C-alpha cells in the first residue's frame, strides 16, 4: 500500500525555483495541487496559494512533463442531487 503523505512537503515559491534549476521531471495537476517528480525519484506536493497560468508557459520551454486532470465529481451527475 501506498501513502500519499510519504512526499515531501513544498512551498510554491520552492517548487518555482527548482523548476528555474530544471531539476523537475514532471508536474501533475489536479484542482489546487500539484503533485511533483523529481529527475531523482524523489516525491513531493506542492499547494498553489495562487493560481498561476504563466507557470503552465514555463513547463513547456523547459521541456517538462505535463498532465492536466481536473478533479471529478461524479455525484453531480445525479438529477436527484437538483
Keep these: 500500500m501506498a501513502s500519499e503523505s510519504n512526499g515531501r512537503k513544498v512551498d510554491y515559491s520552492t517548487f518555482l525555483q527548482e523548476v528555474n534549476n530544471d ?17 531523482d525519484s524523489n516525491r513531493y506536493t506542492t499547494y498553489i496559494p495562487v493560481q498561476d497560468p504563466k507557470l503552465l508557459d514555463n ?7 505535463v498532465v492536466g486532470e481536473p478533479p471529478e465529481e461524479p455525484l453531480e451527475h445525479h438529477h436527484h442531487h437538483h
Design 23 to 39: 531539476q523537475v521531471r514532471e508536474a501533475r495537476i489536479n484542482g489546487r495541487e500539484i503533485n511533483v517528480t523529481k529527475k
Design 59 to 65: 513547463l513547456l520551454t523547459k521541456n517538462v512533463k
